[PDB]
């Protein structure tokens, strides 16, 4: 449920005894945890929301000029004053201009004048700030079993219902026991800080279009500043790059405005992530986090339930996911009550030889009603399959044949783990989460090493990191004393793998 | 005389967008919108899962696109070494106090 056909999902287990399943919660995929007990659970990060943003310096990219002024002065009488310049609403620059005979100025030679004009502007760039507090995570999770066609479509009553739940997380209130009447308590405690490395992030809204920007880049943009300001005529700062002054070969200086650079800041925005409904409530797309998840109290609701002997029937052609598993929605009337129902698979029967991954443990049916649809899934082994459902003779079976080899499973798992290794960096650790020694060792080694990788190779671009990896390779063959040339090979391969990022 | 060679648009506008989703296996998206060239379209493989229609699932495909209306054309005309024109002025010295264009 809720995590099928959402590829980039994962399945994580926990070696039973001391529920310690710290998942790397994803705002761009789902994660399903399983346990021999403790009905299998999913978690998917719906949205990310920020409550309060502060109004740091704004920017203007659309300006307008008027009431120009030159204020010529003789080659020797000082240089131009132009009382206009007195005001800051005007932008002015002072230029040495030629002044000859038949030009006034009984002398002649290089004189000077101060060309300038009013700086009126429009289309401000509200570059607000946000901080790791009064931001807000909002997730929804779903246990399997009941709830034919889970399917967020009618989520409204599903958080009121038992199979789905909606959770809000604050850096003030990190804990949340996702309580499911009859199912469990789903203990959760997360790190609402180290998700997106906030406090270096600004919420820019330009043309009612919002996004997040690494505040360093936002500080480095050379447009006019509102600079902190509030109401009152905006005294724009630096006021110069926008307008452009130009004299003739020697004389008569004028000014151009260079119009609006809206699309220019767009093409300069080539790394930000866009963001939506903003109100006093600013929502944004993906951003990960670390969530210690505990199976403290999850009762499976119907381990004693009987296996009512009605004949079961498929409805939809149980296609499989990229993760190899396969979901089926099986309907049946014929019996009543809160039923337990069998679901196994085999290679031969007259054995039924229950084999393979059972994901949707304790599949439960609610009521006496007609052919309830009983959505669930299982995962077959690498060969042909025989998924068996009903009970015995009036059961229903079906071929599968996963067609995914065991070494192939390791392939998909390791390339997935490697992509995690890349994008989550340190956080890719404790993903399969037991508090084991080598786990904290990996966390720490990546901590120091990748932090150095940041501070040294600061924000290496696509092309940059590409050629850096290439020349590191070329050098990894050249140098003697493999000890360091192997380190060249290592960093170069790290760089190239970083260039194998999601971009493909 | 300058001739009107290709112009450029740097200010565009988009509207009436279109996606046209298609199942993992039924071909790939058509989107009769794409039929016109006033619309710009690109075809992308998108995920299509269960509870998403499409009794199958896996990588499906859809063609996102929208109308390309634009403004602020760049008239990049051409000129040739003929029907260009030089214009000079010259002046002999002597008379004409304060010559001074």
């Amino acid at each position, epitope marked *: 449920i809720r995590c099928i056909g959402v590829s980039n999902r994962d399945f994580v287990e926990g070696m039973s005894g001391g529920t310690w399943v710290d998942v790397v919660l994803e705002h761009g995929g789902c994660v399903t945890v399983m346990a021999q007990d403790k009905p299998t659970v999913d978690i998917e990060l719906v949205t990310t929301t920020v409550s309060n943003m502060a109004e740091v310096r704004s920017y203007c990219y659309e300006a307008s000029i008027s009431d120009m002024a030159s204020d010529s002065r003789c080659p020797t009488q000082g240089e131009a004053y132009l009382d206009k310049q007195s005001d800051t609403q005007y932008v002015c620059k002072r230029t040495l201009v030629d002044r000859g005979w038949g030009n006034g100025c009984g002398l002649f030679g290089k004189g000077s004048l101060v060309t300038c004009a009013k700086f009126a502007c429009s289309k401000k760039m509200t570059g607000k700030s946000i901080q790791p507090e009064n931001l807000e995570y909002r997730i929804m999770l779903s246990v399997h079993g009941s709830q034919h066609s889970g399917m967020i479509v009618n989520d409204t009553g599903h958080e009121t219902d038992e199979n789905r739940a909606k959770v809000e997380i604050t850096p003030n209130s990190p804990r949340a026991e996702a309580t499911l009447g009859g199912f469990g308590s789903l203990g959760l405690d997360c790190e609402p800080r180290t998700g997106l490395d906030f406090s270096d992030l600004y919420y820019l809204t330009m043309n009612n279009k919002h996004w997040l920007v690494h505040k360093e880049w936002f500080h480095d943009i050379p447009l006019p500043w509102h600079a902190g300001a509030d109401t009152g005529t905006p005294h724009w700062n630096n006021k110069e790059a926008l307008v452009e002054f130009k004299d003739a070969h020697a004389k008569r200086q004028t000014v151009v405005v260079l119009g609006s650079q809206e699309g220019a800041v767009h093409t300069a925005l080539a790394g930000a992530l866009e963001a939506e409904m903003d109100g006093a409530k600013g929502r944004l797309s993906s951003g990960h986090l670390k969530c210690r998840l505990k199976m403290d109290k999850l009762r499976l609701k119907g381990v004693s339930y009987s296996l009512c002997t009605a004949a079961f029937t498929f409805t939809k052609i149980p296609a499989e996911t990229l993760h190899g598993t396969v979901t089926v929605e099986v309907q049946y009337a014929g019996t009543d009550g809160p039923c337990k129902v069998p679901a196994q698979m085999a290679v031969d029967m007259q054995t039924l030889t229950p084999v393979g991954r059972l994901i949707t443990a304790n599949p439960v049916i609610t009521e006496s009603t007609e052919n309830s649809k009983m959505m669930l899934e299982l995962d077959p082994p690498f060969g042909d399959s025989y998924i068996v459902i009903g009970v015995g003779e009036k059961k229903i079976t079906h071929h599968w044949h996963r067609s995914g080899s065991t070494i192939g499973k390791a392939f998909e798992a390791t390339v997935r783990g490697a992509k995690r290794m890349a994008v989550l960096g340190d956080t890719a650790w404790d993903f399969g989460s037991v508090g084991g020694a080598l786990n904290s060792l990996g966390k720490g080694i990546h901590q120091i090493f990748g932090a150095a990788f940041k501070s040294l190779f600061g924000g290496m671009s696509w092309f940059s990191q590409i050629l850096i990896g290439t020349l590191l390779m070329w050098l990894g063959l050249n140098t003697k004393n493999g000890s360091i040339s192997l380190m060249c090979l290592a960093l170069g391969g790290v760089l190239i793998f970083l260039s194998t990022a999601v971009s493909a | 005389n300058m001739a009107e060679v290709r112009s450029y648009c740097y200010e565009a506008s988009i509207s009436d967008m279109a*996606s046209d*989703s298609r199942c993992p296996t039924q071909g790939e998206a058509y*989107l009769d919108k794409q039929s016109d060239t006033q619309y710009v379209c690109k075809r992308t493989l998108v995920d299509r899962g269960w*509870g*998403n*229609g*499409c*009794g199958l699932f896996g990588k499906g495909s859809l063609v996102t696109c929208a109308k390309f209306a634009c403004s602020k054309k760049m008239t990049g005309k051409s000129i040739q070494p003929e029907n260009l024109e030089y214009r000079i002025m010259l002046s002999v010295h002597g008379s004409q106090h304060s010559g001074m264009i």
Partner: antibody, heavy 132, light 107 residues
């Protein structure tokens, strides 16, 4: 309350194009495939085509290939049908209807249907006559 | 490819009678069949989805059945509001067709 409404009856020139509107009420406009179905005065019903209010996806039958266009209008929650190159058979009544699990953008009939397959908001029927 | 015959062409019966209509298609339409009745100048009447299912609000006066290719609708007891043209139509393969009709008349 879930309910569809058509435009008034109309009369057009042979070879012209007629556009009938269909406005929805009582439901989220992006959750129901709009089916158009024709009915000549003495003839039965014959399904014309389908559009999805979301994304403006379209399809029809060969009896109208090249004349039928079907567009969305998400703002007022409406769908607009144009018949082009009108012909003497076009004098009929056309119906628009909401349909099933309109998940993305299609007909999508291998999965389930029914529960007013397309029959809750059959509206009022758009009478069109084609002559001079 | 979607040819569906709907028999008979017409009928007329007294009040309180059972009537049945048949529709057989040239194709396999396992359960994707539906039934309406429409007056002249009316939106049709809620009758049947999936050829076996009564819709909410529909009187139990109506029933539908049939599995493979041919399907039977039945009015249990005729009533004055049953005058209409009845239609059966498939849902699959998407050249969606209907029946030409089954017309009623009270005696």
């Amino acid at each position: 309350e879930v309910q569809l409404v058509q435009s008034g009856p109309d009369v057009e020139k042979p070879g012209a194009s007629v556009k009938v509107s269909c406005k929805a009420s009582g439901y989220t406009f992006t959750s129901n495939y709009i089916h158009w179905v024709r009915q000549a005065p003495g003839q039965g019903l014959e399904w014309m085509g389908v559009i999805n209010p979301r994304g403006g996806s379209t399809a029809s039958a060969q009896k109208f290939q090249g004349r039928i266009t079907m567009t969305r209008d998400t703002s007022t929650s409406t769908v607009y049908m144009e018949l082009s190159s009108l012909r003497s058979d076009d004098t009929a009544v056309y119906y628009c209807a909401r349909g099933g699990r309109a998940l993305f953008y299609d007909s999508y009939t291998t999965p389930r249907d029914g529960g007013s397959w397309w029959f809750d908001p059959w509206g009022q029927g758009s009478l069109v006559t084609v002559s001079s | 490819d979607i040819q569906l015959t709907q028999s008979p062409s017409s009928l007329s019966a007294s009040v309180g009678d059972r009537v049945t209509f048949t529709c057989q298609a040239s194709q396999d339409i396992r359960k994707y069949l539906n039934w309406y009745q429409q007056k002249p100048g009316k939106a049709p009447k809620l009758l049947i989805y999936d050829a076996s299912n009564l819709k909410t609000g529909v009187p139990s006066r109506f029933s539908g059945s049939g599995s493979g290719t041919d399907f039977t609708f039945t009015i249990s007891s005729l009533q004055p509001e049953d005058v209409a043209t009845y239609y059966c139509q498939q849902f699959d393969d998407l050249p969606i067709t209907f029946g030409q009709g089954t017309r009623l008349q009270i005696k």
